[PDB]
Structure 1
Amino acid sequence: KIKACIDEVTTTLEETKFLTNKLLLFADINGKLYHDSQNMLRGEDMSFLEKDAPYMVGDVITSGDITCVVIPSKKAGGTTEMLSRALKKVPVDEYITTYPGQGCAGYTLEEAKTALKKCKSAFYVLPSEILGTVSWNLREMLAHAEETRKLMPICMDVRAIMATIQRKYKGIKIQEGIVDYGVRFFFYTSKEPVASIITKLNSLNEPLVTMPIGYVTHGFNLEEAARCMRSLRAPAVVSVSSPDAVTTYNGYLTSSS
């Protein structure tokens, strides 16, 4: 059940803390917390969560007032029914939590809400850059990346883009990952899932100039590409098709699923 959303308007954190001290965190099979659950921590010792890893979906781990549940991953085939069932394994109580299974190709906000509402526990739910969206063509993007020395993610499987690159940067040895030849490229495939490309770029944590990842290449429309791009944390200049798409994209990026 969802007792309240902690929007700071209607409900506040310090006031909810009178009701319960218990937190419900969401983890993956590897014992790694979902980003929203990680942002709920304030220097608590989370070492205990790796002491018993790897986990099975539905595994419940408790240390003091922190409870962690191992949830199914949507980007690996997990359904809403599987999500609700992993939540039913949590001992019935009052918890401060977030929407489970957010973001790139993860569960939608409505699916996360449903799973929390279906649960028998009472939940106090905490809620889950625009300045970077441009409308530059490939030429303009390449010129920017060569001048700034920024990393430029590029889908290796877009034939028209590869021909342009090979003609502009003659003798380029195209290979997966980092290729520093005129421009510092980051070559990725349409085979590698978007969430995986995003994790690799988030890890590399450096300035990027890119198109919205997965748009067309991985079967995403603009909205779906934007929703996945929310999970990109590395500083990025993001180029959309037309100037008309800039506002559209910003709208999808700024919304709630």
Structure 2
Amino acid sequence: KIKACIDKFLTNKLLLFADINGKLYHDSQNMLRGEDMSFLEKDAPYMVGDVITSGDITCVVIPSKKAGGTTEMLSRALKKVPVDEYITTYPGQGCAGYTLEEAKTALKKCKSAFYVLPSEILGTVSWNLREMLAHAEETRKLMPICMDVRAIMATIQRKYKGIKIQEGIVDYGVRFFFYTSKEPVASIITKLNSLNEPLVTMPIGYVTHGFNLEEAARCMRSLRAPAVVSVSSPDAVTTYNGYLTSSS
């Protein structure tokens, strides 16, 4: 049951979430204040629902929605945590993972009491491919482009003739980043955050991966590398910014 939502002094015990390997979730990693996280790697790998405790720090291995995990599966792993008062984050965030509404219900269904901590408008433009390519060639920024979009690929081969289209980085006029509709959105986002370069992209997964503007905006939240996100119409700018700011 969600006792309160923060909008730490005073109450003790924290509830952190980790994966099978033992790596903590992004939201739960930020909750740390330089504590000894050696106890978590000492018993790795874990099964879904495994509870690890070291004093006040309590960790639970939760199922991954992007890996097929269900709401019922998450709620069941949360029931394995010993009933107490905890300061936590929302479990399973965020690209292709559990939504804020799904995570809220999971915590509310649990017998334990929770104090839940919460999880750019300027970067949202309305540029077409021609406009974006001009920006990319001058700024020397990386341009994430879906290889499986024939219409876009044609424009690229016509403007940048002699290009050898291959997966990943292709520096030929524009520093392109070619991704497939085969490769998961969370996998592409992980690859771009690792590179930590300035970007000029469209909402990753929109159309190409079966996402509508709302869904692609939720995955874009997990993008940490500075980016210029381009949407179709100028009317879509405010919409995309609405889906980005609001709840999952």
- Shared fold per TM-score greater than 0.5: yes
Gaps of 5+ in 1: 8-16
Matched residue SS, 1:62: strand
> CA-to-partner distance for each residue in 1:15-34, whole Å, 9 max, x for gaps?
xx455310000111121111
Deviation, 1:78, is 0.6
Pairwise CA distance, 1:63: 1.4
Q: What's the CA shift string for 1:151-183, capped at 9, x where partnerless?
A: 000000000111111111111111111111110
Please give the per-residue CA displacement for 1:216-244, whole angstroms capped at 9, x wherever unaligned: 00000001011110111100000000111
Distance apart, 1:68 and its partner CA: 0.6
1-side partners of 2:151 and 2:236: how far apart?
Answer: 21
Whole-angstrom distance in 2 between the partners of 1:28 and 1:247: 35
Structure 1 runs (4+) deviating above 4 angstroms are none
Distance 1:87 1:251 in 2: 31
Is residue 180 of structure 2 the alignment partner of residue 175 of structure 1?
no
Q: Which moved more, 1:180-189 or 1:37-46?
A: 37-46
The worse-fitting range, judged by mean Cα deviation, of 211-220 and 108-117 is 108-117
For residue 55 of structure 1, report the CA deviation from its aligned partner. Answer: 1.4
C-alpha deviation, 1:6, in angstroms: 1.4
SS in 1 for 2:83: coil
Secondary structure of 1:113's aligned partner: helix
- State how far apart, in whole Å, the 1-side matches of 2:198 and 2:247 are: 26
Match of 1:93 in 2: 84
**TM superposition shift of 1:61:** 1.1
Give the superposition deviation at 1:54.
Answer: 1.7
Q: Distance in 2 between matches of 1:74 and 1:149?
A: 36
Cα distance in 1, alignment partners of residues 138 and 189 from structure 2: 24
Q: Deviations over 1:112-169 (max 9, x none)?
A: 0111011111111111111100011101111111101100000000001111111111
Following the alignment from structure 2 to structure 1, what is the Cα–Cα distance between the partners of residues 168 and 41? 30
Q: Which residue of 2 aligns with 1:158?
A: 149
The CA deviation string for residues 185-237 of structure 1, in whole angstroms up to 9 with x for no partner, is: 10000011111111111111110000000000000000101111011110000
Mapped partners of 1:54, 1:151: distance in 2: 36
Q: Secondary structure at the match of 2:39?
A: helix
Change (3 A) 1:150 1:64: same
Instruction: Name the SS of the counterpart of 1:49 in structure 2.
Output: coil
Larger mean Cα displacement after TM superposition, 46-55 or 73-82: 46-55
Shift of residue 48, structure 1, vs aligned partner: 2.1
Task: Give the structure 2 partner of residue 230 of structure 1.
Answer: 221
Paired with 1:98 and 1:150, the residues of 2 have a C-alpha distance of 34
Question: SS at 1:25's partner residue?
Answer: strand
Q: Secondary structure at the match of 1:69?
A: strand
Distance, in Å, in 2 between the alignment partners of 1:19 and 1:130 is 35
Report the Cα distance in structure 2 between the residues aligned to 1:140 and 1:164, rounded to whole angstroms: 12
CA distance change for structure 1 residues 169 and 100 in 2, over 3 Å: closer, same or farther? same
1:210 is matched with: 201
Of the structure 1 ranges 132-141 and 47-56, higher mean CA displacement relative to structure 2 is found in 47-56
- Give, in whole Å, the separation in 1 of the partners of 2:9 and 2:128: 54
